[PDB]
Structures are given as C-alpha cells and as structure tokens.
C-alpha cells in the first residue's frame, strides 16, 4: 500500500466533481451541488503498485481561504481542470499553479493539466494551445470526458505517476 493525496481544482462548472465521481463510483453526475467539497478514497493498482488514492474534490475556488491553503499544503498532486468550451476556465489555470507553488514554496509540484468536456463539439480552447501551456509548465496534458469516461483513469493515474517521479528528485 502506498497513499497518494490528490486534489482536483478548477473553475466552477468545469467537471471536478463529475471526473472524481466517475473515477470512484463509475457514474456520470448531471447535477452535483457545486458547493459540496469532500474526499473520496479508493484502492487501485497502477504499475504493479497497490495505491490508496485520497482525492479531495474542491468546491469554492477563492484565493483567500484558510482551508484552501491547508489542502494545498497537504495535497501531493493537483489535477488542474478547465473545460474545452470555457476560455475563462483555461485562463484561470495559471492562477491555480501560482497559488500552489506559493503554498509549496517549490517549483516541484506534481500537476496534470486536464481539458475536460472533450465530448462537446463547440470547442473554444485549441488543443495545441493547451499543449503549449502544459509544455511551458513541464506537466502532462490530457483531454477527458467525464460524460463518456474518456481518459478519466488516465488523468488521475498520470498524476500518481508524476508524484512518484518527483519522490525521486
Ligand atoms: O472539512 C473538510 C475539509 C478538510 C480539509 C480541507 C478542506 C475541507 O473542506 S483538511 O485540509 O483539514 N483535510 C484534508 S486535505 C486533503 C487532501 Cl489535500 C487530500 C485528500 C483529503 O482527504 C484531504 N483532507 C481530508 C478530507 C477533507 C474532506 C472535506 N472536509 C469535510 C470533512 C467532514 N465531512 C465533510 C467534508
Ligand atoms: N458534456 C459534458 N458535461 C460535463 C462533463 N463534465 C461535467 N459536465 C457537466 O458540467 C456541469 C458541471 O460539472 P461538475 O462536475 O458539477 O463541475 P464542478 O463545479 O467543477 O464540480 C454538470 O452539469 C456536469 O454534468 C463532460 O465531460 N462533458
Ligand atoms: Mg463540484
């Protein structure tokens, strides 16, 4: 058993809850109250390791929050989610990365950039712009659909793999 403390952040409505609940409970939620902040624990096997994932699905995204500072201190990896049909949510990404780096007082922050809602046809964020942003940060970029489950496990398992790479640096 190895524990991994993951935190899902991103603007309201991008699919943080839907992604987390798809991973843990294998169903898509259409109407999950946006103010619910809670953790979900589950054992999974990734690269031959039995992993305990302890995932915090965050609700409020306010800068000034003692509890956000605390979960940024405690969290080991961060899933930074935007929606591919919401340019503003893509612009919010750099603020989250900045907040997390400040709390960690480190450049070494395990992070995965997730462009969710890949099933929606009216894209506003070009995949290649998101790939450029991820490259600039030195982090993986994955597009997911919580609705169809596309790359949901990939997003969270990639974040686990990032935490291991960092545990050796
Ligand atoms: O009271 C909380 C709660 C607790 C905390 C932060 C935010 C938050 O909404 S905490 O920092 O004191 N606990 C953490 S941080 C954390 C991380 Cl970074 C990953 C996985 C975690 O499980 C985790 N936790 C504990 C889980 C907090 C759940 C959210 N929560 C209440 C707890 C009582 N039941 C309703 C949700
Ligand atoms: N089409 C589509 N809708 C999604 C997807 N993920 C979430 N949603 C919807 O977007 C809305 C917000 O999702 P939610 O998970 O509550 O967002 P959160 O505020 O980031 O937790 C809900 O109506 C979801 O059903 C997705 O991958 N595709
Ligand atoms: Mg939510």
Curated annotation (Swiss-Prot):
Per the record, GO CC terms? cytoplasm; cytoplasmic side of plasma membrane; cytosol; endoplasmic reticulum membrane; focal adhesion; Golgi membrane; membrane; mitochondrial outer membrane
Q: What is the effect of changing residue 12 to S?
A: In GASC and JMML; also found in lung carcinoma; somatic mutation
Reactions listed under catalytic activity: GTP + H2O = GDP + phosphate + H(+)
- Impact of changing residue 61 to H on the protein? In lung carcinoma
Impact upon substituting residue 13 to R: In pylocytic astrocytoma; somatic mutation; increase activation of the Ras pathway
Anything known on activity regulation? Alternates between an inactive form bound to GDP and an active form bound to GTP. Activated by a guanine nucleotide-exchange factor (GEF) and inactivated by a GTPase-activating protein (GAP). Interaction with SOS1 promotes exchange of bound GDP to GTP.
Q: Where is this motif: Effector region?
A: 32-40
User: Assembly state and interactors?
Assistant: Interacts with PHLPP. Interacts (active GTP-bound form preferentially) with RGS14. Interacts (when farnesylated) with PDE6D; this promotes dissociation from the cell membrane. Interacts with SOS1. Interacts (when farnesylated) with GPR31. Interacts with RAP1GDS1. Interacts (active GTP-bound form) with both SHOC2 and PP1c (all isoforms) to form a tertiary complex; SHOC2 and PP1c preferably bind M-Ras/MRAS, but they also bind K-Ras/KRAS, N-Ras/NRAS and H-Ras/HRAS. Interacts (GTP-bound form) with MAPKAP1/SIN1; inhibiting K-Ras/KRAS activity.
This chain belongs to which protein, by name? Answer: GTPase KRas
């Amino acid at each position: 058993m190895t524990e991994y403390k993951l935190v899902v952040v991103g603007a309201g409505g991008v699919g943080k809850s839907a992604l987390t609940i798809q991973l843990i409970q294998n169903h898509f939620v259409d109407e999950y109250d946006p103010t619910i902040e809670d953790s979900y624990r589950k054992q999974v096997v990734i690269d031959g390791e039995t992993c305990l994932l302890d995932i915090l699905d965050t609700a409020g995204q306010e800068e000034y929050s003692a509890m956000r500072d605390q979960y940024m201190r405690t969290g080991e990896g961060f899933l930074c989610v935007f929606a591919i049909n919401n340019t503003k949510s893509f612009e919010d990404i750099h603020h989250y990365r900045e907040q997390i780096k400040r709390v960690k007082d480190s450049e070494d922050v395990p992070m995965v950039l997730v462009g969710n809602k890949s099933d929606l046809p009216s894209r506003t964020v070009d995949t290649k712009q998101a790939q450029d942003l991820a490259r600039s940060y030195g982090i993986p970029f994955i597009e997911t659909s919580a609705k169809t489950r596309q790359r949901v496990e990939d997003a969270f398992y990639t974040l686990v793999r990032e935490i291991r790479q960092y545990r050796l640096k």
